[PDB]
């Protein structure tokens, strides 16, 4: 059992896992969607209620047992070991879609190495529609069918989505994006090549550069006209909207997927931690850092958005129509296009995006690798590197379908599914098992023998009452809202929302499958079957 080396490595790795590439285009826009300045109170309330306790429980479970994601159940509740396979499937889908998003970002960064950025102009071969969504103009030119030049660059030069008719017509493949994702996967494999020592040593670099970049972007966008209205609308409270349950659901889900429990990542990181390590300080510091980073990212994004909205001399909230990753690659592309320093800012921003994605990819792949390794102790001689290569190959195979010309549809599908009521359900089952079958008293005693002091009554009541109930409430709210995805001029058909449902279910189905397998593997009556299933086995 190898350790983290220096204590800073574990904290930096957890922080890098916390700072997701998704929240650098989601969090400010969705904050604007609900409340804005008044969204912070539900955000922090739901954080304290359900996100921090789940982070603490995952860190404590990972540290106490020194195991991965499939053997901690053997050490806790053997009947619920299918959570490991669910985590593996979730990590596979996440790696696929997240790495093709990385491929898009890397292609953008490569195209950003020119003195004149290619997305500023509309004279290119891929600019065939309209070019009326320009900036720094005084005339009145606006039609309902216009398209921004950056939108043309994104959807017709990098994505090349104009060559596909939707999810039913996935024709062609982008070789440039293929090479970009090949380089990205090679970097990921070389980072998780040997173990966690090199992973921490590279996280020392790829997790601190994003913070410097964010600081530079914030303090250079603050000196831009029109940012005042953007930051005001970001911090304009709307207490009337806070009455409905939708804002509460949104805040709880946002904090849950920003901290990100149930992915099997924190358990792997905490497994390499010493027994005498203090989980309380690390968990609190990481949660505070994640919240502050989200706030700073929202601040700088809204500063840029308000700057360009005042430049356009038009009303605000008419530019946030681009949701998901398109927000960055369109809005920020235009922003740095109009900025004095274009190449420098574009390269810096896309490098920061690459590092943000790199931290998450390293974290998830190392978590799944540790889960596989700990499940099979007889595979510890040389299976590390070969298993890393196999996982990278499997992720490449999964991203191959998303690598097509019209792959953006399946990317936006795998982004909105397998990241909804699937990780939430996995985390809910994890918490239920740990605090109902393993016993809250036993877990508290283990944490007391770990740190030296038992957690206060706040955790002891929250873990048992609020977090499972809040996760169940989130799942119930999400299941009652039908999904209607909408990409650029494409409405998803009925079969798309069924394929997404099947994809989301395929990961979750592992837990009931293993439940039935372990129930039927041993003969006997049902009652003592569930008796021995819950009770663990001594080493």
């Amino acid at each position: 059992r190898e350790t983290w080396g220096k204590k800073v490595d574990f904290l930096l790795s957890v922080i890098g896992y916390a700072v997701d590439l998704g929240n650098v285009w989601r969090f400010p826009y969705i904050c604007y969607q609900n409340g804005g300045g008044a969204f912070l109170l539900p955000y922090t309330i739901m954080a304290i209620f359900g996100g921090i306790p789940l982070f603490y429980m995952e860190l404590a479970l990972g540290q106490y047992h020194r195991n991965g994601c499939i053997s901690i159940w053997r050490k806790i509740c053997p009947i619920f070991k299918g959570i490991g396979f669910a985590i593996c499937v979730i990590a596979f889908y996440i790696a696929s879609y997240y790495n093709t998003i990385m491929a898009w970002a890397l292609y953008y960064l490569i195209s950003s190495f020119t003195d004149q950025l290619p997305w500023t102009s509309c004279k290119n071969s891929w600019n065939t529609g309209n070019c009326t969504n320009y900036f720094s103009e005084d005339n009145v030119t606006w039609m309902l069918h216009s398209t921004s030049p950056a939108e043309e660059f994104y959807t017709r030069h990098v994505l090349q989505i104009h060559r596909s008719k939707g999810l039913q017509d996935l024709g062609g493949i982008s070789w440039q994006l293929a090479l970009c994702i090949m380089l990205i996967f090679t970097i990921i494999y070389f980072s998780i090549w040997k173990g966690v020592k090199t992973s921490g040593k590279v996280v020392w670099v790829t997790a601190t550069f994003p913070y410097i970049i964010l600081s530079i972007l914030l303090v250079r966008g603050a000196t831009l006209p029109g940012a005042w209205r953007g930051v005001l609308f970001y911090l304009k409270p709307n207490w009337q909207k806070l009455l409905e349950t939708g804002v509460w659901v949104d805040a709880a889900a946002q904090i849950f997927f920003s901290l990100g429990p149930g992915f099997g990542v924190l358990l792997a990181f905490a497994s390499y931690n010493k027994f005498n390590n203090n989980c309380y300080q690390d968990a609190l510091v990481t949660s505070v850092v994640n919240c502050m980073t989200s706030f700073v990212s929202g601040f700088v994004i809204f500063t840029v958005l308000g700057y360009m909205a005042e430049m356009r001399n038009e009303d605000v909230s008419e530019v946030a129509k681009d949701a998901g990753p398109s927000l960055l690659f369109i809005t920020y592309a235009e922003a740095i296009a109009n900025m004095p320093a274009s190449t420098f800012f574009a390269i810096i921003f896309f490098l920061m995006l690459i590092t943000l994605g790199l931290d998450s990819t390293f974290a998830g792949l190392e978590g799944v690798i540790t889960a596989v390794l700990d499940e099979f102790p007889h595979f510890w001689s040389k299976r590390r590197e070969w298993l890393a290569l196999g996982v990278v190959i499997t992720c490449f195979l999964g991203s191959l379908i998303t690598l097509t010309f019209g792959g953006a549809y399946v990317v936006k599908l795998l982004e909105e599914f397998a990241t909804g009521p699937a990780v939430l359900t996995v985390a809910l089952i994890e918490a239920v098992a740990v605090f109902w079958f393993y016993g809250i008293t036993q877990f508290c005693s283990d944490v007391k023998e770990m740190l030296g002091f038992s957690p206060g009554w706040f955790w002891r009541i929250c873990w048992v009452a609020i977090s499972p109930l809040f996760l169940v409430f989130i799942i119930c709210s999400f299941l009652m809202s039908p999904p209607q995805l909408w990409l650029f001029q494409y409405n998803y058909p009925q079969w798309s929302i069924i394929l997404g449902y099947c994809i989301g279910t395929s990961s979750f189905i592992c837990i009931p499958t293993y439940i039935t397998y372990r129930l039927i593997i041993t003969p006997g009556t049902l009652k003592e079957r569930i008796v021995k299933g819950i009770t663990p086995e001594t080493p």
Partner: antibody
Amino acid sequence: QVQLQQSGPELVKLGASVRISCKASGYRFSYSWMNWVKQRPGKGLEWIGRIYPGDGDTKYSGKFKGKATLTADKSSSTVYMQLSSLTSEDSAVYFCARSAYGSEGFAMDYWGQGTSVT
Amino acid sequence: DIVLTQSPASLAVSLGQRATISCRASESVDNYGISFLNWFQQKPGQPPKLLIYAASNQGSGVPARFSGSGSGTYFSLNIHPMEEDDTAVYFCQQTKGVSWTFGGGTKVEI
């Protein structure tokens, strides 16, 4: 209704220059390439270059880059194409056409009338 | 630079017959699913007139008899039924990255 107006016929002595205009109208002048075409008497078409009035960028085909200069005035919607050190080899008819968008293949849908430069 | 060769250099097609014009490029012209090749028509003493754009779509003032085809490296333009007013020197032009060039010119007679 897209109409392109070109300058009249001109005569240039051996060792002088010329300035050929092209007044486009009827469309978005800043959002379409302006391509000049050279045609010797009895020979085939020869591409001279292109210019984008929106950004002012200019492109060329071959050795014409060192001889032909392309300028565009947005206010007057006129495109100029200067020739330096004209000789007998350039006694041709120069056309001016506007290119289309991307998926149209930058098509030369609308042409001018050609100037018989001697 | 892409070099285009026109074959045949001169065509003699009787009235009512189908004409065939072939344009071969040095490299490929497809960039984003669109064939960056266009077909022109130049009568003597008249400016060139666009016939087919994107190698498959006809122009506004082009009759349905003119049909263009060809993707990648080989492109062909067929006129059927050919009439008398088709006695013009056809051209094929590419609109690739930097330098654009014309073909050789097919003199269709009769």
